[PDB]
Each structure stands twice: as C-alpha cells, then as structure tokens.
Symmetry: C2
Subunit: 208 residues, 2 copies
C-alpha cells in the first residue's frame, strides 16, 4: 500500500490525502514531530531535504506534485488523452504557483503582506473560474469529464483561501459550485469531516 | 507551417530547455517574439491564462507554464521514461530543477547584488541531489533517469549551464554532473543549436544579469 511521511499539518499533503480518500485508497501516516525533524538525520536522508516523503511499495518519492502526478497516472486521474493531460498539468502548475505565494505569505510575511495578498486574490482566482467556464459550463471538473489530480489540488487551494479570506469565491459562481460539488462526493465529504483532517492545522506556524 | 509555436520575450529564460529539447529531437518550430513594449501595452498579457509567457501552441492546443510545455513534449515525443515508475522519477527530478530555478530567478531579478555570495555558498548543497541521482543511475554514465533521455534532462542541463555562467567552476565539485553536461552538450543536433546565433545571441535573462 501507501505511506506518507509528513509533519502533523495539512500543508502540501492535504490534496494527495483527499485524492487517496476519495479514490477509496488505503494508506499509512507516519507523523514527524518538530523534535524529530530538528534532530537532522531524517532530513539529511531526504532527496531535497524536505517532506513529504511517499512510499508506493519499493518506490520512494519526494515533492508533493510528483506524488500527485504519480497517483494521477497510476489511478487514471490524468485526463482521457495526451491533450487533456497537458491541460491538467497547466491547471496544476497554476495551482502550485498560487500555493507558493500563499506559503510565502503564511511563513515569511503574514502580518505586513496579508492586505496586499487579499487585494490581489481575485485576479489570482479568476483564471480557474475562466477554465471552468470553458469546460461544460463548469458543471463537471477543471479538465474534461473526469476527475484529475489537479481537481484535488485546486479544491485544497480554494478551501484554504476561504479560510484566509472568507467570501473570496462569492464573486465566482462556477468555483463556488465546484467546491460544493466536489466536497459533497461521499468519500471526500467523509474525509473532510473526519478529525484526521479537521484537527490538523492547515500550516505549521499557527497562521491561516 | 511548423506545428509548434513558441511565444516569448527575446531571452533564453524559461524557454531554453524546451528549445534544446525540440532542436535535439529534430522538431521544427516557430518563434514569435514579444517586445517589452508590446508586453507593457497589456492586451497580450491579459489574454494569457496566468498573465505570463511563455505561451506555446501545438496546433490549436494553447499551453502556458514552461513545465507544462516540457511535460507535454515529453509525453508526445516519448521523453518521459520507459514506464510508470520512471515517469515518477522524471517528475521528481524536474520538480527539483524547478525549485532551484525559482531560487535562481529570485536572485537574478530580485537581489543579485545583495544575495549572490550567499547563493553561491549555498549552491553546492543545492546541486548535490542531482549528483546523487546520477551516482545511483548506472554510475551516472547515461541520463538523469533510466537509460533514455527525458524532458528532465534538458531542463537540468539548462539549469547547470546557466549556473556555470553565474558561478564558474561550480561543477568542479561534482564529477558526474560535469561529465553529464559535457556529454549531453555534445549531442550533435544539440551541440549545433547551442552554438547557433538563435541561441547565443539571446541573453539568459531579461534584465542583463547572469
Ligand atoms: Ca478516471
């Protein structure tokens, strides 16, 4: 089966967890404490000195988007053909871009930078509304007619931004409905309601 | 009439790797050059999905994000590993390359003067993982993943080339990466491209720094 190794936070594992839960997959959580991380030995063994670390049998992976793409490819959550796969990547790279900005805010410039960030947020979310508007009237998924790993990543991005800036999706009807619809998928709904998700902080420094 | 079009500023930047890939694979493409003046006018930018270039056209398929373009070409040209496991390793390498490219770009555009010394001191620790990956793959005598070239090779190669300009001799501490750069750079179609005016007469970055 699968093992994800990570700090006790949602962070860069939230999306891959939602994917695994929604897809009825089983996995083991190996929690790494701040104390264990500071010891240095685990960190030194990681390829890029970072978690998450992910095990799929004898395969060991690092990088959250590498793990998402791997599950996407192996579980068939990567579009119906090559053309759709490229669109899936384009969405995910866009999600990753905004996630990086979010992470920079949270960890390095929260107090001073929040106001500018929130003011800029509508312009950063609009591309995803536009993409939805151009795919079956936004009624299905972010790419094509089937769920992809980019959907789970985008959903997480949107959920953590509603916490950061309540009402940020109010001007975006397709994104709003999309969040409601995906969140209502029975296995995902169950996971999002579970203490396993709810009782972890979004980030590691108490800010959100 | 070529099926590929690259729309970008007159710089190597985030299009260098994908151009190397296309040239080395003997594929034809069109370059559409966007001046800073045109970009500042704002209408092209507004038409871009995330407000940025590169924009890439493969027939009527329009893509943005340089790594989206690399993965797409990797898929369509068979440069994405021999199986699913290798595909994942290729992704893991490319994400690593992207991470270091982001720090590089931040240095170049955001604080070259203040940050360069610190960056160059941190650099060996940042390059080591790629040496390690090479050491674990056939003694580093072929490619970064498996025994066939991947899009991650072209991206890593570009990363290494631009860091040798930033920090001459930075690869002296990394025998496998050094040999790897020499070896890939000598691939006939790629060697020819890297020597051509089309590559040489473009600056690495958009602000005169390297
Ligand atoms: Ca499917």
């Amino acid at each position: 089966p699968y093992t994800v190794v990570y700090f006790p936070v949602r962070g860069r594992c939230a999306a891959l967890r939602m994917l695994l839960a929604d897809q009825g997959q089983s996995w083991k959580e190996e929690v790494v404490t701040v104390e264990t991380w500071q010891e240095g030995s685990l960190k030194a063994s990681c390829l890029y000195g970072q978690l998450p670390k992910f095990q799929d049998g004898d395969l060991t992976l690092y990088q959250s988007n590498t793990i998402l793409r791997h599950l996407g490819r192996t579980l068939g959550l990567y579009g119906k053909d090559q053309q759709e796969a490229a669109l899936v990547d384009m969405v995910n790279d866009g999600v990753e871009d905004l996630r990086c900005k979010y992470i920079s805010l949270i960890y390095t410039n929260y107090e001073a930078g929040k106001d500018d960030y929130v003011k800029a947020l509508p312009g950063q979310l609009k591309p995803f509304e536009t993409l939805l508007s151009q795919n079956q009237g936004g009624k299905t998924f972010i790419v094509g007619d089937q769920i992809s790993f980019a959907d789970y990543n985008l959903l997480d991005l949107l959920l953590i931004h509603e916490v950061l800036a309540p009402g940020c999706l109010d001007a975006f009807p397709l994104l709003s409905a999309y969040v409601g619809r995906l969140s209502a998928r029975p296995k995902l709904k169950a996971f999002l309601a579970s203490p396993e998700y709810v009782n972890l902080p979004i980030n590691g420094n108490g800010k959100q």
